[PDB]
Design a protein around this ligand. Structure first.
Ligand SMILES: NC(=O)C1=CN([C@@H]2O[C@H](COP(=O)(O)OP(=O)(O)OC[C@H]3O[C@@H](n4cnc5c(N)ncnc54)[C@H](OP(=O)(O)O)[C@@H]3O)[C@@H](O)[C@H]2O)C=CC1
Ligand SMILES: CCCCCCCCCCCCCC(=O)SCCNC(=O)CCNC(=O)[C@@H](O)C(C)(C)COP(=O)(O)O
Ligand code: SF4
Ligand code: SF4
Ligand code: SF4
Lengths: 156, 144, 318, 112, 44, 340, 176
């Protein structure tokens, strides 16, 4: 159907815009943030891919939970995620963020950021290498490329 | 002047990639139009190039195949597509390409490398690998 | 056909702003041993379009504590004023030729400041309020020195008509006559556009995002477009005022090319300064302008008032 | 034994009453600032319940230390150091009711 | 024969470790003279 | 056959023994049902027909492995069989207040539930929970409730031992009932047919409904019984809307509107290709007074005491307040007059 | 032993005063910084063209865990559980039973890639070289459960990366 073709092409345009311009928020909890900065560094510059760190949650599109999320910090993380406008995607970097890692059995650690906020891509490692984080970001971009919001709207 | 030489080198880059169409193809797919020595090509189609003149970290690069394991990778390429044998050459763990120094042949080693399969029907699903520990009594089938 | 002219001025300027974002990202990256955006489009050309589409397809949030009317009005004011200021500029022939175009631009720049203050106040957030107050302090610091420098330079022009600047600088650039005023004017333009080292209103490092901390999606895109358009417009004003260009009336394209190149160079200098220098403290900015720029500007204004009289070089009024 | 703040139980009771006054007056301000959906009566009942939980204490030093901890919590609430999550944790809304009768515990699980 | 990662026989070459911020530019008198000359020519 | 012994203390990591397929879990009621299931430790299988992004909010609700998302199509029975194959419980919460080009009221409230019930009976699922409005009846003016009654009949036919829960308007943060009335402020005055004096409604809190569903799953007696879920108090529509505007601290301007004019307005909003703001069916259902069905068992039978609207109204309606009234306490607005 | 940063006094001669006055009025030092930035503009960028270009790594890299086999095809693991014992994060769960042949093999071998700290232990600890952190670093997943590896998954990884893992072990086995 011509309507299906138009919807598919418009969805392609929107997904391309969203994946090409991915603005992570300046959120780094722990050692994994340093590998994130190295990703921002010249060798693996993420600005080439359109990933620009923006501080304000309302002006950001992706939250990368780099570092251990303590029970004290979890409400702030949830608040920052909520204040972030949608579409919003969450990437969990490092074993500490993914499932608690080295401090899984600590009283003051949330055993994974999945408990607090929905996570789209999990980047393994402790710390994950900057190339690994870039791979995760590109995987998130492909995931956005696979999204079918307008097609589902037309079919619904 | 050196400027004329640089422009001529750009034209040589255009020719070396197979013409304007190949030049544009490489530019869009990989964003790099450098021409380098083709060290080899894997069974999946990935072509590996080397330019020792370029600084460390750019001397070796791989042009991912357009089709691998039944997936169209003309635009969607990923690091996992690199087969293990060429992985060490690409990541500079070794200085010898697999063609020059082949890996040891073992029966158990996979013959077809699979890329990251997360988000696909082939994605790994965790499960317990141990049998039931406690066995329950089976009631008798006779009434009494 | 005047509507066609207005659209011709507006639409290309916005595209220029979009590609200025790409240029800045690449120039800063290369000055930082990086490559600016290159993945999205050939040499990163399509990155702006992707950013605009992403922002305008992103949910806009109206803060619960915000005053909605001012919250919405402020970006509209910023963008409309940014586009309006381009109208009087002679490139080479102005869209609207005003006898007092320079004062018009000064007043319009004064009006644009309220967009930042209104946005910050309506946001009803502490960081936004701090950014608005910083914008107030910045205007207090820079407006007087800007006006005095412009008056001193325009004394040689003989009028506030922008077009007549071309005739005055027919034989030589005015920077040779007034290079100190030119330096102070360039710094003052940096201050007015809220650009580094005077990027205090936004002040990401110190204030999470400054006045726009509570703005998302389209309104933030409008604020960004206003900012970049103001950068380009102020640099074009500097090019017209000091770095004059040859105008052949039969071929305006030559003047247009020269002017565009000079403005591009000045905007590149803006990005260069943003990369090189650190940021000032707003107390330090106000002190610089009031304690250092203002006395020298007063002395040079006296000098430029006297010089045409003592050298019999009073410019023609017409 | 060295007294923490009070040498006898009556003095500790006086301190406890002062702390209770402070919490009782603070409760409405807490509901307003934290935008809690509980009523003021509900919060003050929770305050009484928290005070009553430790009503069995008979040692002056333990009572003084409890008053110190309560004052620290009150300081947290008076400031916004504690978030709405921390304030509402006293009300275990998410946790399901746990039966205390013998038969219900026997049915549900092996727990004593 | 033992083969460990050891310094080259005779040691490595000296490594510079001190500030080398260069001395550049004209004298202040000269810069002021150039500015004033430009001002005068522009005025004429 | 698919029977699991419950283990643990009822926490996130515990095994409740409940394996469920919550159809229409990506919705107002589905969110709370899935959250309650996950907190116990139950395995929740979510069939989703939308984009995976919209299902992301349900991902944190359960522990690792508890929540499994499988794409399903209402028209295709094989997807229903795949989703319900290994479940000991199936909950059908698929309902759209507005008809769509692909799926009309008949398909969503009759065909879909019937296919779900038939496939569940074939698969061997022990228990099925179906949701139909309390006001559902075959002679009702609204097509929505008419199809709801027909679907209830068909579901009982396909699954004889099926629990059917008949809930009233379910007020909650994501509700389209309180938000619907509050959103009418944007249009100026609040249009009411007969000014709302003739209509009486008995709203139910969303959390109460979800807890009732979970207890019905837990309760052995619930099989083959129809429960009616209703709130503690009955209100006239005028009083309820006035209370909504009072708690929202928004000016109330009730103006009577003829029924035909309201129906024409509903037709106007039905034109929207996207989710319609209001529909003629929406107007009819709003005007229709909530039925009183003493015969059917209610929340009290399942052990849950209905929360009054007064207690939870501020949660839903605080967001609609302006900056001046955002911090106002719940107690400032007195309870509305109750027709009981 | 100690050096004085700062602790320098400017000259007061007229020439030095004029030079400092020129620096203040004519902004010389800011111009020097601008020149440095320009020089960096004209220097070659350091960005690598990932994914097409990959950063250097050594044979001692610690990445995705893998279970190796002997050349025969028998699994090297002998269910020592000492590698489980040395795990700093307790990320390895091992259960074993005598197999039909009678050999000591692992019925269960699980590494939680979400509790692992990628310390590199149990590669040093494991006596038979069975468990090895291989070269792979790009094993990101879209779900948490995918990162809870199983014995089957680990053995599949070992089979997949055995060619590279063996070469790296050969490179670094003498250093160990
Ligand atoms: N007040 C109440 O809420 C009342 C509840 N009910 C019934 O209980 C349920 C409550 O849901 P509600 O809170 O209104 O939220 P929704 O309207 O969002 O519920 C619909 C759910 O089913 C899915 N769905 C909708 N249409 C279709 C379709 N044609 N095919 C397949 N799936 C579909 C939706 O997902 P998606 O968005 O992807 O389509 C969503 O998960 C409904 O079935 C409703 O009729 C009964 C009486 C009153
Ligand atoms: C929002 C609600 C949150 C409220 C939280 C308030 C708190 O933290 S309560 C902490 C204060 N605890 C105490 O003071 C313990 C007092 N312990 C005692 O033993 C005394 O009360 C005595 C000795 C029993 C005397 O008390 P009575 O007068 O008998 O009774
Ligand atoms: S995962 Fe490792 S590197 Fe990252 S924060 Fe935790 S300990 Fe540090
Ligand atoms: S080396 Fe690895 S496989 Fe072998 S016993 Fe130790 S943990 Fe098990
Ligand atoms: S490398 Fe991995 S498996 Fe080995 S001890 Fe470290 S975390 Fe455990």
């Amino acid at each position: 159907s011509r309507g299906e073709y138009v919807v598919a092409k418009l969805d392609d345009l929107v997904n391309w815009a969203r994946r090409s311009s991915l603005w992570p928020m300046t959120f780094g909890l722990a050692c994994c943030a340093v590998e994130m900065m190295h990703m921002a560094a010249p060798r693996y510059d993420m600005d080439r891919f359109g990933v620009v760190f923006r501080a304000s949650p309302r002006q950001s599109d992706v939250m990368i939970v780099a570092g251990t999320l303590t029970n004290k910090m979890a409400p702030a993380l949830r608040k920052v995620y909520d204040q972030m406008p949608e579409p919003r995607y969450v990437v969990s970097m490092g074993s500490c963020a993914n499932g608690g890692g080295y401090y899984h059995y600590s009283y003051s650690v949330v055993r994974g950021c999945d408990r607090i906020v929905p996570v789209d891509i999990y980047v393994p490692g402790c710390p994950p290498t900057a190339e690994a984080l870039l791979y995760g970001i590109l995987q998130l971009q492909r995931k956005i490329k696979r999204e079918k919001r307008l097609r589902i709207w037309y079919r619904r | 002047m050196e400027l004329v030489q640089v422009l001529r080198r750009g034209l040589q880059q255009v020719s070396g990639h197979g013409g304007l169409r190949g030049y544009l193809r490489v530019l869009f797919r990989a964003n790099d139009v450098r021409v380098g020595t083709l060290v080899g090509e894997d069974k999946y189609g990935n072509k590996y190039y080397e330019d020792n003149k370029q600084f460390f970290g750019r001397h070796r690069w791989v042009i991912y195949t357009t089709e691998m394991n039944g997936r169209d990778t003309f635009w969607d390429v990923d690091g996992s597509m690199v087969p293990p044998e060429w992985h060490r050459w690409l990541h500079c763990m070794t200085d010898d390409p697999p063609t020059t120094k082949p890996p040891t042949a073992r029966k158990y080693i996979w013959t077809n490398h699979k890329f990251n399969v997360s988000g696909t029907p082939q994605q790994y699903v965790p499960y317990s690998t141990t049998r039931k520990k406690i066995q329950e009594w089976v009631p008798p089938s006779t009434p009494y | 056909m005047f509507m066609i002219n207005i659209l011709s001025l507006i639409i290309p300027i916005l595209l220029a702003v979009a590609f200025l974002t790409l240029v800045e990202r690449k120039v800063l990256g290369y000055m930082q041993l990086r490559k600016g955006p290159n993945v999205v489009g050939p040499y990163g050309l399509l990155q702006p379009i992707a950013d605009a589409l992403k922002l305008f397809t992103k949910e806009p949030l109206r803060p619960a504590t915000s005053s909605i009317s001012m919250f919405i009005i402020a970006p509209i004011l910023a963008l409309s004023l940014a586009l309006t200021m381009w109208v009087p500029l002679p490139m080479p022939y102005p869209l609207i030729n005003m006898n007092l175009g320079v004062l018009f631009m000064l007043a319009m720049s004064s009006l644009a400041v309220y967009s930042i203050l209104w946005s910050g106040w309506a946001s009803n957030s502490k960081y936004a309020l701090i950014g608005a107050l910083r914008a107030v302090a910045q205007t207090i610091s820079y407006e007087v020195t800007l006006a005095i420098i412009l008056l001193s330079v325009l004394l040689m022009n003989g009028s506030y008509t922008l077009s007549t600047l071309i005739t005055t600088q027919e034989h030589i650039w005015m920077i040779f006559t007034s290079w100190p005023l030119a330096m102070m004017w360039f710094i003052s333009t940096l201050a007015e556009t809220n650009r580094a080292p005077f990027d205090l209103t936004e002040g990401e490092s110190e204030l999470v995002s400054g006045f726009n901390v509570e703005y998302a999606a389209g309104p933030f895109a409008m604020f960004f477009m206003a900012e970049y358009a103001n950068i380009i417009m102020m640099n074009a004003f500097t090019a017209i005022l000091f770095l004059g260009a040859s105008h052949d009336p039969h071929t305006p394209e030559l003047y247009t090319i020269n002017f565009v190149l000079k403005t591009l160079a000045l905007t590149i200098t803006f990005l260069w300064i943003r990369a090189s220098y650190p940021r000032f403290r707003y107390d330090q900015l106000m002190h610089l302008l009031w304690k250092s720029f203002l006395p020298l500007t007063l002395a040079l204004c006296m000098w430029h008032i006297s010089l045409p009289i003592m050298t019999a070089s009073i410019p023609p009024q017409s | 034994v060295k007294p923490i703040f009070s040498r006898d139980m009556n003095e500790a009771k006086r301190r406890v009453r002062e702390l209770y006054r402070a919490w009782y007056r603070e409760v409405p301000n807490t509901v307003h600032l934290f935008q809690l959906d509980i009523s003021v009566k509900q919060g003050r009942d929770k305050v009484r319940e928290m005070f009553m939980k430790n009503a069995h204490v008979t040692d002056p030093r333990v009572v003084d230390l409890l008053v110190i901890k309560g004052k620290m919590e009150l300081e947290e609430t008076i400031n916004v150091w504690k978030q709405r999550t921390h304030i509402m944790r006293f009300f275990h809304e998410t946790e399901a009711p746990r039966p205390t009768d013998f038969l219900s515990k026997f049915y549900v699980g092996h727990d004593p | 024969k033992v083969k460990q990662d050891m310094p080259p026989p005779g040691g490595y070459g000296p490594i510079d470790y001190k500030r080398n911020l260069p001395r550049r530019g004209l004298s202040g008198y000269s810069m002021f003279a150039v500015g004033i000359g430009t001002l005068l020519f522009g005025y004429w | 056959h698919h029977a699991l012994i419950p283990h643990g203390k009822g926490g996130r990591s515990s095994v409740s023994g409940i394996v469920a397929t919550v159809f229409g879990a990506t919705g107002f009621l589905g969110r709370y049902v899935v959250n309650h299931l996950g907190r116990m430790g139950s395995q929740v299988i979510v069939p989703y027909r939308c984009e995976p992004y919209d299902t992301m909010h349900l991902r944190p609700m359960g522990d690792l492995g508890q929540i499994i998302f499988m794409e399903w199509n209402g028209k295709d029975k094989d997807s229903i069989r795949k989703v319900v194959e290994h479940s000991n419980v199936v909950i059908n919460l698929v309902g759209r207040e507005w008809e769509t080009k692909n799926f009309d009221f008949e398909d969503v409230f009759v065909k879909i539930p019937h296919a779900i019930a038939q496939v569940s009976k074939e698969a061997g699922v022990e228990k099925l929970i179906h949701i139909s409005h309390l006001n559902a009846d075959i002679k009702s003016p609204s097509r929505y409730l008419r199809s709801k009654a027909v679907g209830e009949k068909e579901v009982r036919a396909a699954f004889p031992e099926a629990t059917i829960i008949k809930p009233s308007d379910i007020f909650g943060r994501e509700d389209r009932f309180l938000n619907y009335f509050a959103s009418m402020r944007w249009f100026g005055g609040v249009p009411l047919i007969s000014l709302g004096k003739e209509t009486v409604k008995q709203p139910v809190y969303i959390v109460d409904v979800s807890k009732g569903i979970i207890n019905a799953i837990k309760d052995p007696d619930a099989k083959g019984k129809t429960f009616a879920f209703v709130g503690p108090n009955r209100y006239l529509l005028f009083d309820l809307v006035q209370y909504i505007f009072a708690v929202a601290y928004r000016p109330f301007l009730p103006y009577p509107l003829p029924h035909f004019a309201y129906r024409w307005v509903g037709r106007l909003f039905e034109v929207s290709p996207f989710e319609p703001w209001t529909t003629r069916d929406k107007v009819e259902r709003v005007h229709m007074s909530d039925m009183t069905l003493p015969h059917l068992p209610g929340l009290e039978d399942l052990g849950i005491q209905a929360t009054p609207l007064e207690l939870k109204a501020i949660e839903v309606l605080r967001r609609h307040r302006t900056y001046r009234w955002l911090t106002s306490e719940m107690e400032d607005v007195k309870p509305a007059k109750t027709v009981n | 032993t100690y050096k004085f940063v700062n602790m320098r006094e400017p000259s007061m001669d007229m020439k030095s005063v004029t030079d400092r006055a020129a620096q203040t009025l004519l902004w010389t030092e800011l111009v020097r910084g601008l020149g440095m930035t320009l020089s960096y503009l004209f220097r070659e960028p350091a960005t690598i063209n990932y994914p097409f270009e990959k950063g250097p790594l050594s044979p001692r890299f610690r990445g995705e865990h893998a279970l190796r086999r002997y050349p025969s095809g028998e699994e090297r693991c002998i269910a020592c559980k000492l590698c489980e014992a040395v795990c700093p994060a307790q990320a390895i769960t091992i259960e074993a039973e005598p197999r039909a042949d009678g050999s000591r093999r692992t019925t269960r071998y699980d590494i939680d890639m979400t509790k692992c700290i990628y310390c590199g232990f149990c590669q040093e600890a494991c006596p038979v070289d069975a468990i090895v952190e291989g070269p792979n670093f790009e094993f990101s997943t879209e779900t948490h459960e995918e990162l809870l590896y199983n014995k089957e998954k680990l053995l599949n990884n070992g089979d997949k990366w055995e060619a590279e893992i063996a070469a790296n072990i050969q490179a670094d086995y003498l250093y160990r």
